[PDB]
């Protein structure tokens, strides 16, 4: 009955019909990791506008809600340490923090000559005046742009791991996390029949609650982001993330804006954590494992109640959407894939996602673009992962939950599915 599919064109037709039926190492769709238009990075622009209204304009019912948000975040997801130590010591990036950037990106002698080229006095904080200038607020000196980019990336790395410092051992973020670390975390705590609360947030591309922007600002301040770093980020992006990008247009941005995108994703993940602290409360603290990335989160051992939703809707312009899931029954989704249970090995693993991979190969690929796995071998090997018998039934029920239903055989001829 599955014999037609091993023709490539019946396969592509079944894929088109499936992807029409359900139309609406860790692809989240340095690093430390025909559509609707939205700004370059909306949430960062919101945060900087809130920073401007911190003094230019002064909003109780929003600032009080922001305070309640920060205190829920600090009580339900944090161990309770390093807050005064992080406030009393704002983030300052050294010349060593730039070496470990230029070496890990281009090499040791590159960093030697770079520091050697900008008088990077070692063990010393990088003096901001070497790459930003006041006007008579601040502005990037157009001469040395790589320095500003490197020190923005240093801010990003320090923010990431300081968040890692403040959070409780059960709260996990996908930053700085190797695939095998995530594998171990997933395998230790996910057995067949476990309850998993999955959550999506589909509105980080639109105006915040404004209390959420002010919350993110306060949490960045508590992490060590002072007014000077704020001024730096303003000069870097305060005139860039107010503009929408043409949908259907390829852009090859510089590194400063990949870093802007990075702390945008960071602020989004922070807001995800605070929203989960807001909805789950104690059930988040006592979970043995909670994972967050961007607008994706899963929480182990927690099941919904009729009254999570009256708080899920408590945000304007936000669509916070719960999903109840059960290991091997409702296989949960997280960050471009499912959490299945390989059960020849007897452990839970995370594997990628056919709907998203196929909707991804629905777009054309040129030759100038590097192809680590061209001609659908990146598809061949995870077809081999989800067409082996320790996974395939758990996956077919996962897709019964998501979405014939045996498209994995149709996925094996490559350039036909692009259409």
E strand intervals along 68-225: 132-134, 138-140, 171-173, 195-201
At residue 241, the 3 state secondary structure works out as: coil
Closest C-alpha among 300, 360, 298, 385 to residue 334: 298
The stretches of 116-254 forming alpha helices (DSSP H) are 145-166, 179-189, 211-223, 227-237
Closest of 27, 32, 79, 301 to residue 188, by C-alpha:
301
Return d(Cα 86, Cα 167) in angstroms, integer: 13
How much of the chain is in helix, strand and coil states, percent to nearest 5?
A: 45, 10, 40
Output the six-digit token pair for 278: 């807001």
Report the C-alpha gap between 296 and 125 in whole angstroms.
36
| Site of tokens 């259907």 | 248
Q: What is the CA radius of gyration of the chain?
A: 23
**b (16+ CB within 10 A) / e for 136-156:** eebebeeeeebbbbbbbbbbb
Instruction: Determine the Cα–Cα distance for residues 271 and 215; give it in Å rounded to an integer.
Output: 8
Alpha-carbon 82 to chain mean position: 24
Q: Determination technique for this PDB entry? A: X-ray
In the numeric block, which tokens belong to residue 35?
């559509």
Could you tell me the strand order of the sheet in which 296-300 lies?
171-173, 290-293, 296-300, 195-201, 320-326
In three-state secondary structure terms, 339 is strand
In angstroms, this model's resolution equals 2.6
Cβ proximity of 340 and 180 under 8 Å: no
The answer to whether 203 and 271 are in contact (CB under 8 A) is no
Alpha-carbon distance of 310 to 124, in angstroms, equals: 51
């Amino acid at each position: 009955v599955e014999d037609s599919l091993q023709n490539p064109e019946v396969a592509v037709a079944a894929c088109n019909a499936f992807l029409e039926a359900n139309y609406p190492x860790x692809x989240x769709x340095x690093x430390x990791x025909s559509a609707v238009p939205s700004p370059f990075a909306n949430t960062l622009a919101n945060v900087l506008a809130a920073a401007t209204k911190r003094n230019c304009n002064v909003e109780l019912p929003t600032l009080d809600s922001a305070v309640l948000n920060v205190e829920c975040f600090k009580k339900f997801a944090c161990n309770g340490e390093y807050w005064q130590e992080f406030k009393d010591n704002p983030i300052r990036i050294t010349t060593e923090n730039i070496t470990t950037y230029v070496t890990r990106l281009k090499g040791p002698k590159a960093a030697a000559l770079f520091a050697k080229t900008h008088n990077l006095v070692p063990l010393q904080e990088v003096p901001m005046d070497r790459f930003v200038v006041d006007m008579k607020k601040v502005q990037v000196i157009q001469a040395a742009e790589p320095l500003a980019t490197a020190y923005l990336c240093g801010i990003h790395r320090e923010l990431v791991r300081r968040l890692k410092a403040v959070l409780a051992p059960n709260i996990h973020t996908l930053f700085d996390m190797s695939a095998e670390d995530f594998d171990a975390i997933i395998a230790a705590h996910f057995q067949p029949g476990d309850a998993v609360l999955e959550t999506d947030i589909a509105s980080f591309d639109k105006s915040q609650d404004d209390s959420l922007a002010l919350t993110a600002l306060m949490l960045l301040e508590d992490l060590g982001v002072d007014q000077e770093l704020l001024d730096l980020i303003e000069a870097a992006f305060g005139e860039i993330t107010s503009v929408h990008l043409p949908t259907g247009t390829r852009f090859k941005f510089g590194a400063m804006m990949k870093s802007g995108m990075f702390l945008t994703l960071f602020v989004n993940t922070l807001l995800n954590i605070v929203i989960a602290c807001r909805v789950l409360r104690e059930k988040l603290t006592n979970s043995v494992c909670a994972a967050f990335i961007g607008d994706d989160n899963i929480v182990h051992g927690v099941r919904s109640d009729p009254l999570m939703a009256e708080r899920c809707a408590s945000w304007v312009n936000m669509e916070v959407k719960i999903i109840d899931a059960t290991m091997c029954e409702k296989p949960p989704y997280f960050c471009g894939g499912f959490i299945l249970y390989d059960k020849v090995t007897g452990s839970a693993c995370r594997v990628a996602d056919p709907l998203k991979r196929l909707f991804k190969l629905g777009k054309p690929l040129p030759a100038g673009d590097t192809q680590d796995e061209d001609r659908r071998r990146a598809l061949k090997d995870e077809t081999d992962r989800w067409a082996r018998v320790g996974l395939k039934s758990e996956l077919e029920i996962a897709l019964s939950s998501r979405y014939t239903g045996n498209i994995v055989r149709a996925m094996a001829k490559n350039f036909k599915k692009l259409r």
